[PDB]
Structures are given as structure tokens and as C-alpha cells.
Design a binder for this molecule. Sequence first.
Ligand SMILES: Nc1ncnc2c1ncn2[C@@H]1O[C@H](CSCC[C@H](N)C(=O)O)[C@@H](O)[C@H]1O
Lengths: 265, 265
Amino acid sequence: MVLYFIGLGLYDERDITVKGLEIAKKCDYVFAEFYTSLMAGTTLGRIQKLIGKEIRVLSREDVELNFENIVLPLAKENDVAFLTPGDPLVATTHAELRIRAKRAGVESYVIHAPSIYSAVGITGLHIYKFGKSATVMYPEGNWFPTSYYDVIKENAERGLHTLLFLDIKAEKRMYMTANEAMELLLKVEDMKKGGVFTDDTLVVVLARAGSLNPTIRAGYVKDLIREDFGDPPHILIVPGKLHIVEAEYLVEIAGAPREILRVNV
Amino acid sequence: MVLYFIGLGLYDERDITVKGLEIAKKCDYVFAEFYTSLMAGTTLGRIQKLIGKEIRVLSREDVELNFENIVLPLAKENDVAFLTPGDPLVATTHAELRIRAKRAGVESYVIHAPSIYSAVGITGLHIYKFGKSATVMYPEGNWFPTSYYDVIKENAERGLHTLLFLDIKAEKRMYMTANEAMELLLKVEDMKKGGVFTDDTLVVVLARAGSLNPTIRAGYVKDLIREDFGDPPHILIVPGKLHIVEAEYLVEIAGAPREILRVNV
Ligand SMILES: Nc1ncnc2c1ncn2[C@@H]1O[C@H](CSCC[C@H](N)C(=O)O)[C@@H](O)[C@H]1O
């Protein structure tokens, strides 16, 4: 008896690691959640087909409130897996579920899978130069979140890049676009006026990482804010000071304006 | 006419994704490099047997000096794969290779795989709280580099965690251990007196991420500096102030002392 947290990867069902597939195939019960991220290139059926097991999908409430009532009981008598998009423990609160497993006497194992957190490397930006990350959250009611704006400011002060995860309302099938996140940011800048995010800010958009042809675009907010980046999911990145080879790659691979080649050192 | 950058993942031959494996099997020629890092849980023979293709290994000079003369020519009239440990393009210099492909008129696609950059999610530390990353380098001769110490200081200053890659002599298969990294940083502390890394600093050690049995340990330097964390590779993390949920994961899963619950939160 054991519980496995198995990541499914960035885009489709083949983004699972071979390790994860052969372990998932021999589990007695398989559960999964698809609310922490969007795998735009597959379906439940295709995943079930690949793993050869029926998958029961859990909602945020089933997990956050009933994980120990729905999943853990089986794991005491059987080999159980819990599948998630990307890497199970990245920008989720799933790590705490391991604590629940322990206090229920269930041993758990983690099988990693490609994550958007490291897949940003395809933007050409040096991974080590990424600072603190943040999430753009949809304003709801009279509440307008803005903390992600300060993260950008503090990273950019240090010359660090900022990775911006975008909001998701899976049960409403709403996936925030980079365009939406740019609009939100311009609005917070008119409030705070820190010169952090303007029409002239260089940004990078990565859409559907993991697919064979993801959309990778770099340019000024004024030029990109109304551009079509294709289907979700999307992440937005606000680079800090660029190394020359970073700029080179943004121009050659992501279609950035030639002039960012001229780095002001 | 196509070059595929395929990641092999964290630890053994099963850490490659299903997508990467299937694509590698259909490639006419398969290259790989093991200088940016090593796949400590497997061998080149086991990877070859899994892919069912002979793998020509390239040195760092083969790649950096002659990538366009060794790999790209074949990719003009064949499907070629270039394998690398972890996630492709996380290593600083690899992105550039895609520009070389473009220049040579060769199509390139990136197949992602788990990277230690994202796998540290398994320490229970929130991914978004990681700041700039650094590598602890072995000093030698009259050269004692210490920038990695500076990186810790300005992340922790901002309440951020610091991911520290450890030095490696890929070709001699010599891995720097977390213990050596800790002693070094105490050495740098004695040099710089910044109050950044001392006996009382809380650290996290992650060894053999990707394995089903990785070592995850958290505690104060005075206690962990001579502890055996098992076979390489080792990764060292100097956490910033912890969220209570991070601290209880470290206590419950990483064997951290209860003391962190009131000293580091
Ligand atoms: N393939 C992909 N392409 C672009 N953005 C992606 C993505 N997968 C995830 N994201 C981003 O991350 C958000 C979910 S955050 C959860 C991330 C997941 N554990 C992982 O390891 O990737 C999405 O709303 C989106 O902004």
C-alpha cells in the first residue's frame, strides 16, 4: 500500500515521465485533479487510455477538504496514485497533502514531470536570473489584488527576471491570457505609479509550453498587449537586465525588436 | 531537417518523458552531452538500451566549439536528437544552440523534462519564494570565488529561499557534497563576516531528486555539516523566512527540529 503523487507534465499525456507511466500503470486506484493548471493538448480519455486505468477526477474541494477521506483510505490497502498537470508540488499546495498522508500512516512518493517553472528556459532567459515569482489574480468584487506588481518591482531593482503565473478558474473554464495580465498590470501601475510596468516595458509571453510549437513572443507591452498568442495556458515574464545572449535569443527565436540587442550596461 | 533537444530528467533512464523517448526512437542520429551534469542513477548503456539507438556523446568543446560541424550537418537531411540531463535550456549556454540551428537552416524543437529547478518543490518550500539561484564553486589555486554567498544574502534579505547548485567535475565524475558546500560557506562567512551563513543557519539538503528514495533533510548547519546524505548528486538550499506550512513540512517530512517552528517562522 502506498500513495504516489505523479506529475503529468506541461501539455499532453505524453509529458508524463516513463517512470510515472510504468508506476501509474500498476496502481490499483488512480485519482487526479485538473484545476491547478491546464493541459491544452490532451483529454481525460487519452490519459486514461495511456495509463490503462479509469481516472477519477477530484475538485478543489474534494482535495483541500476531503483528500484524507477520499484518497488516503484506499492507500492503506492498495497502491494509489494522484495525478496532476505539470509537477505536482510546483505552485500548488499539494505538498501539505504529504503531511496528511504521513499522519494517516500512508507512505508517499513523488514522481516529477516537466514544469512551467523550468520550461521558461525555452524563452532564452537564464534560469538562474529569475527572482521571486508571483501570480496575477483576477480581481473579484471590490477586491483588486496587486501584490504581484511589487514582486516585479523588487526583482527588476535587482536586475532579475519575474515569472508570472496567470490565474485560472477551472470550474468556469477561465484561463487568464497574457493580454489580460498586461491590462491588469497597466492599471496597477496607474495606481502605484512606480514606473514598473508601462507601454514601454519589455515582456515575454510563453503559451502552451510543452507542445511542439509553443508561442514564444518578446516585445514592448504597447505592441503585444493586443496580440493573439493562441489558446491558453499562458505565462507572462517581465525580464530584468538582459545579458547580450539573452537579447540575441529573444530577437532570433521570439521575434523581439532588434533594438533590445543594444543593451545598456 | 529537424533537431530535437530532449531532456533526460533528474536521475535515471526512466526520467525522460514518454514524448522524449518516442521521439528519440524515431531519430536517425542521437547525440548527448554529460558535461553540464550527470545522470547518477543510470548509465549510458542503460539509456542506449532504453532508446534502442547508439548514442554519441559530445564533450563541452564538441558542443560549444563545433555543434554546427558535428550535430547540425546530419540534421539537414535527418531527424536528430540532442539529449541533455534535466530540462533542455536550463543550462545557460544551451539556448544559444537553437540560434545556431536557425542559422544553419535547421528546425529545432524542445522536449522538456523534470529539472532540479522545479523538483525542489519536494522540499516543501514554496516555489514562488525562490529567488536568484547560484552555484557553489570549488576554489582552486589563488582563486576563491564567493558570489554565491552574496546571492544568499540578498535573497534571504528579502525573505526568499536560495537554490544552490553544487560544483561538479563531470569528466572526472567528482560531485561536491552538501557537506563540502556547507564547510565552504562557513569559510566564506569567516572571510566576509556578513552573518549570512553560520552554525545556526537553517539549511535543506536534497539528494538524488528523481529517485524514488531521495534524501530530504533540514536542520541547522552545526547538526547537518557532518551528516551522511547518501550518494550524489546533492543540492543545498538556504531558506528565507518560512511560511508555517513550509516549516511543518520540513519537520514532518525532512526531519527538521521542532525548533524551526518558532525560530525560522
Ligand atoms: N504549458 C504551459 N504553458 C504556459 N503556461 C503554463 C503551462 N502550464 C502551466 N502554466 C502556467 O502556470 C499556471 C498554473 S500554476 C501550476 C503549475 C504546475 N504545477 C507546473 O508544474 O507547471 C497556469 O495558469 C499558467 O499561467
